[PDB]
From Swiss-Prot, chain A:
Keywords: Ribonucleoprotein, Ribosomal protein, RNA-binding, rRNA-binding. The lineage of its organism: Archaea, Methanobacteriati, Methanobacteriota, Stenosarchaea group, Halobacteria. Part of the 50S ribosomal subunit. Interacts with protein L18 and binds the 5S rRNA. Has been cross-linked to L18. One of its GO terms (cellular component) is ribonucleoprotein complex. The gene is rpl21e. One of its GO terms (biological process) is translation. InterPro entries: Ribosomal_eL21, Ribosomal_eL21_arc, Ribosomal_eL21_CS, Ribosomal_eL21_sf, Translation_prot_SH3-like_sf. GO terms for molecular function: rRNA binding; structural constituent of ribosome. Belongs to the eukaryotic ribosomal protein eL21 family. This is one of 5 proteins that mediate the attachment of the 5S rRNA onto the large ribosomal subunit, stabilizing the orientation of adjacent RNA domains. Pfam families: Ribosomal_L21e (PF01157). This is Large ribosomal subunit protein eL21. It comes from Haloarcula marismortui (strain ATCC 43049 / DSM 3752 / JCM 8966 / VKM B-1809). SUPFAM superfamilies: Translation proteins SH3-like domain. Residues 1-65 are annotated as: Disordered.
UniProtKB/Swiss-Prot annotation, chain B:
Keywords: Ribonucleoprotein, Ribosomal protein, RNA-binding, rRNA-binding. GO terms for biological process: maturation of LSU-rRNA from tricistronic rRNA transcript (SSU-rRNA, 5.8S rRNA, LSU-rRNA); translation. InterPro entries: Ribo_uL30_ferredoxin-like_sf, Ribosomal_uL30, Ribosomal_uL30_arc, Ribosomal_uL30_CS, Ribosomal_uL30_euk_arc, Ribosomal_uL30_ferredoxin-like. It comes from Haloarcula marismortui (strain ATCC 43049 / DSM 3752 / JCM 8966 / VKM B-1809). HAMAP family: Ribosomal_uL30_A. Gene3D superfamilies: 1.10.15.30, Ribosomal protein L30, ferredoxin-like fold domain. This is Large ribosomal subunit protein uL30.
Curated annotation (Swiss-Prot), chain C:
One of its GO terms (cellular component) is ribonucleoprotein complex. Belongs to the universal ribosomal protein uL5 family. This is Large ribosomal subunit protein uL5. Keywords: Ribonucleoprotein, Ribosomal protein, RNA-binding, rRNA-binding, tRNA-binding.
UniProtKB/Swiss-Prot annotation, chain D:
One of its GO terms (cellular component) is cytosolic large ribosomal subunit. GO terms for molecular function: 5S rRNA binding; structural constituent of ribosome. InterPro entries: Rbsml_uL18_euk (IPR005485). Pfam families: Ribosomal_L5e (PF17144). It comes from the Archaea. This is one of 5 proteins that mediate the attachment of the 5S rRNA onto the large ribosomal subunit, where it forms part of the central protuberance and stabilizes the orientation of adjacent RNA domains. Keywords: Ribonucleoprotein, Ribosomal protein, RNA-binding, rRNA-binding. GO terms for biological process: ribosomal large subunit assembly; translation. SUPFAM superfamilies: Translational machinery components (SSF53137). HAMAP family: Ribosomal_uL18_A. This is Large ribosomal subunit protein uL18. Belongs to the universal ribosomal protein uL18 family. Coiled coil: none annotated.
RNA sequence: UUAGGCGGCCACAGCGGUGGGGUUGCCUCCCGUACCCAUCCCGAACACGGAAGAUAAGCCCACCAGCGUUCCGGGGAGUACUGGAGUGCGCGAGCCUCUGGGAAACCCGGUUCGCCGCCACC
RNA sequence: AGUGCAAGAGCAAAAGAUAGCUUGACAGUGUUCUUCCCAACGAGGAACGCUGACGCGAAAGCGUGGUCUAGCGAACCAAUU
RNA sequence: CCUGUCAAACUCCAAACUUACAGACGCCGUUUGACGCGGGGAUUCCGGUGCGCGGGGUA
């Protein structure tokens, strides 16, 4: 890479298809998860806050408590165990 | 149920392919195993497709091979009718063979090593550089095609 | 059907597009209510570089205040046709514009469930000339 | 509409009925919403909760089914609003609902407004709602005094036939009084 | 310089003029020749078909086209035929003209990418194929071997 | 749902167009400014008070595919591209065979003129 | 379109414009991610909390500077609270 | 309206394929103790080649 910021090489993954453009629905920004649930991490290009580092987009972790309204999801980067602070807006229920 | 025979060695073959063969209980050239025809197994042989010879053998042939190259989970013991009868659910080799073919049991389940360590093909095989459709010995075979190989390596 | 289809005057905007005012006074008497400043956009050569800047005033008259005004304005104008909107409006003159439309216009001006008026329910240049011409004067 | 790249608003935005930015802020509380809505002739008050396939209304009150309790006056005024609020508020309590936040939709937060009147009613019914007392009407106007005094400048009945000529903020008391004990559907 | 230096399609497509400056103008004079006033209303239609994907410098395009059309004057300056070269030199080409240090070359030309089997030239003629000859000389000045193909013409 | 309120999915719902519907559950337009409130000027809007009129807007109901969108048949196409294998071919660029996958444009014909939830309601 | 400045990205009853009001560009202390994929490493950065005090709003709520990714600096010594 | 062409820093589309998690089968581990945790000792940080995909370069 020519630079090493968090958004390096994120043009695709953090951009919306022309039609999904604009403010997202509030239903999923308010969804409630329970400790133990499996959730898919995917940043919503439309939602500014509650994001996590673009490198984890695609990960599927486990909800283990929360911090404020944001959730604390545990994942495994390669072989390293990591905890990720993320809001509902960027999480989906597995299955 | 297909008969799998490794015809190409490990040197230079992809590691993930080698592991697969290993998961199929074949760790040497000319070693053979019987595998059920399931989606999971199907995907496996496909990935192994270029270094093996497989096909559905005939009742007879399986019998000849079972008799000639089957072994207990441990030991020299010849697997003959008597052995089959005094150790398995069936009464004789034919009975075992049929059950295998109809995928009702497996060589392990009956206390037999999952591997039939065959002999080098008498008269030689068709080449390990081309597939069957090309006159080679690699890939899927005919029941008659697998039988010849298996019988040559009996 | 009619009654709710027949035209009506909705606001008459009287504005003096000066270039920098004392003019409000006359608009106040000519209409009958306070005028509003007219700020401008963009910086331009007519020493009009100031963005927020009084550069004229206007006055939007509704109901009687509008008629009682047109009952002298119109007479001071001759023109008609071509000088009419495609929506049945027209400006003459110091400017004096007359916005015309039919009974259910609020549907497009309210907050809740607002909706654009259907081309069919719009007012045509012709249907406009009729209404007005039919009120103390002549067309073309 | 124009092309594959065109962006069509969410239905309820097209219909100019839901303010989604406000809705999201509303849902933040995690409490039931006290939906205060009006019509040219009536006033509605619902207690909505979030649901898998959409909102769930656990209790509601309409200015029309107000008569069902002895209302004999118009239903698009302040006294009406308050009462519908209190009515829905009560049915709410019955439902086991204890607190809510006020959703006034696309209406304006004007002081002494009917939506705030609705809010006052729901509060008195016993519902716990984040509010501000001095944004509410001064009780008398809630009662309908502003209208009684307006008919004082009579000369012609403010009410076409309807009931009374000089109107009744008292009829208001009689009703509130009624709703505060027993009766069906409460 | 030799065609050997640029005739292969091994490099990435380089055509974004928004990121490339100083690109030499093309030597290709025209793309439409003959009676361009008329539309393809002819009996016969022959085409010059390139048989290998290659890059053809605007250099070769112009020499090949001239050699074909300049010859199609076996029919006259205002003869009855229309000649078309359908490809355009989009691919910008460089040269490293220090040694291999900072070797990203400087724009020196343009070339058109043609894949095997495309037709680079298409002429329209009445049963009067002098064009077939205008192409024996045309594929004479372009890198690939070529195939002279006739389309509407069962007049053999 | 003989017209309502809050929504979910966010064009299958958009754009355009036709027909039908109201002494009332109703929604509207509509009528009107003493009040709460309101316009840097206007009761336009916002807010409040109210029914003389209307179904012309909106809205609801029925329907039209010309445009846009979704999905499907047949054709393009097992074509383009591609994971695995080859002492197959080619001066080479590159191609071919076996094996596991598999498109886009476009054309023709269907589909789509929203679906679903909760509450309230001759 | 605009949103201070590269480029890419976000944004329409707004993240833009106008008006008004306000100083949350607040003190304290953390969690996590990043810096440094995996996988150890400082300063820096960010996200998300809590305690305290405040601003605005009817209220939910929003404000841990500017929509996001650049604008930064160890020990020793000095000056400052 | 017709007609001729393109894109590493274009995209209405869109693979093969790579990849997170889960279940199944396989293989493995529970005297050969896997997965993992803690600690001791290193070497190493001139690499090369084939094949696939590359970026530069006439090569
Ligand atoms: Cl993170
Ligand atoms: Cl409302
Ligand atoms: Mg990319
Ligand atoms: Mg043994
Ligand atoms: Mg021999
Ligand atoms: Mg051989
Ligand atoms: Mg009608
Ligand atoms: Mg921010
Ligand atoms: Mg020093
Ligand atoms: Mg100092
Ligand atoms: Mg990859
Ligand atoms: Na969105
Ligand atoms: Na040098
Ligand atoms: Na040649
Ligand atoms: Na001013
Ligand atoms: Na109507
Ligand atoms: Na740090």
């Amino acid at each position: 890479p020519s630079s090493n910021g968090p958004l390096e090489g994120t043009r695709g993954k953090l951009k919306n298809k022309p039609r999904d453009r604009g403010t997202s629905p509030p239903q999923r920004a308010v969804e409630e998860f329970d400790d133990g649930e499996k959730v898919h991490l995917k940043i919503d290009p439309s939602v500014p806050n509650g994001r996590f580092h673009p490198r984890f987009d695609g990960q599927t972790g486990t909800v283990e408590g929360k911090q404020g309204d944001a959730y604390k999801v545990d994942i495994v980067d390669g072989g390293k165990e990591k905890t990720i602070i993320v809001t509902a807006a960027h999480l989906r229920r597995q299955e | 149920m297909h008969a799998l025979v490794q015809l190409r060695g490990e040197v230079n073959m992809h590691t993930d392919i080698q592991d697969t063969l290993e998961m199929l209980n074949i760790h040497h050239v000319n070693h053979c195993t019987l595998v059920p025809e399931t989606d999971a197994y199907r995907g496996m042989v496909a990935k192994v497709n270029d270094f093996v010879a497989f096909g559905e053998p005939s009742q007879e042939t399986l019998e000849t091979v079972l008799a000639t190259r089957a072994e207990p989970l441990e030991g020299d013991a010849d697997v003959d009718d008597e052995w089959v009868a005094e150790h398995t659910d069936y009464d004789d080799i034919s009975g075992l063979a049929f059950a295998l073919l109809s995928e009702e049991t497996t060589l392990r389940e009956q206390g037999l090593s999952p591997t039939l360590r065959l002999h080098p093909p008498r008269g030689g095989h068709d080449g390990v550089k081309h597939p069957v459709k090309e006159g080679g010995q690699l890939g899927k075979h005919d029941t008659e095609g697998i039988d010849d190989l298996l019988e040559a390596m009996r | 059907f009619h009654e709710m289809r027949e035209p009506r005057i909705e606001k008459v905007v009287v504005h003096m597009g000066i270039g920098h005012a004392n003019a409000e006074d006359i608009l106040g008497e000519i209409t009958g209510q306070m005028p509003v400043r007219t700020k401008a956009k963009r910086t331009v050569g007519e020493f009009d570089i100031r963005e927020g800047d009084p550069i004229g005033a206007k006055v939007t008259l509704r109901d009687e205040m509008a008629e009682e005004f047109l009952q002298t304005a119109l007479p001071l104008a001759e023109l008609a046709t071509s000088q009419f909107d495609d929506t049945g409006n027209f400006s003459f003159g110091l400017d004096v514009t007359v916005n015309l439309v039919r009974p259910g216009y609020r549907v497009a001006k309210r907050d809740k469930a607002s909706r654009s008026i259907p081309t069919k329910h719009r007012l045509n240049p012709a249907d406009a000339v009729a209404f007005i011409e039919s009120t103390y004067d002549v067309e073309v | 509409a124009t092309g594959p790249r065109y962006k069509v608003p969410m239905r309820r935005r097209r219909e100019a009925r839901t303010d989604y930015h406000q809705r999201l802020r509303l849902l933040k509380s995690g409490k039931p919403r006290l939906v205060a809505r009006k019509s040219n002739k009536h006033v509605r008050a619902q207690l909505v909760t979030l649901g898998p396939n959409g909102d769930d209304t656990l209790a509601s009150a309409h200015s029309s089914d107000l008569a069902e309790y002895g209302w004999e006056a118009p239903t698009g005024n302040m006294p009406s609003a308050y009462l519908t609020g209190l009515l829905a508020g009560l049915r709410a309590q019955e439902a086991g609902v204890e607190e809510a936040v006020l959703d006034i939709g696309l209406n304006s937060p004007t002081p002494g407004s009917k939506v705030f009147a609705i809010q006052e009613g729901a509060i008195d019914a016993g519902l716990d709602i984040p509010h501000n007392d001095d944004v509410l009407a001064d009780w008398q106007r809630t009662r309908g005094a502003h209208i009684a005094e307006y008919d004082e400048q009579l000369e012609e009945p403010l009410y076409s036939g309807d009931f009374d000529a000089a109107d009744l903020p008292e009829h208001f008391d009689e009703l509130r009084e009624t709703l505060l004990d027993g009766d069906i559907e409460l | 310089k030799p065609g050997a230096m640029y005739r292969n399609s091994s490099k990435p497509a380089y055509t974004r003029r928004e990121y490339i400056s100083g690109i030499p103008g093309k030597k290709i004079a025209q793309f439409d020749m003959g009676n361009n006033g008329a539309g393809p209303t002819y009996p016969a239609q022959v085409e010059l078909v390139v048989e290998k994907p290659v890059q053809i410098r605007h250099n070769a395009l112009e020499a090949a086209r001239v050699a074909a059309n300049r010859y199609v004057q076996n029919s006259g300056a205002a003869a009855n035929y229309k000649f078309r070269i359908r490809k355009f030199p989009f691919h910008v080409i460089r040269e490293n003209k220090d040694g291999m240090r900072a070797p990203f070359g400087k724009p020196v030309g343009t070339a058109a990418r043609v894949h095997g089997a495309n037709h680079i030239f298409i002429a329209w003629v009445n049963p009067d194929p002098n064009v077939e000859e205008a192409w024996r000389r045309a594929k004479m000045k372009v890198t690939p071997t070529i195939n002279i193909d006739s389309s509407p013409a069962g007049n053999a």
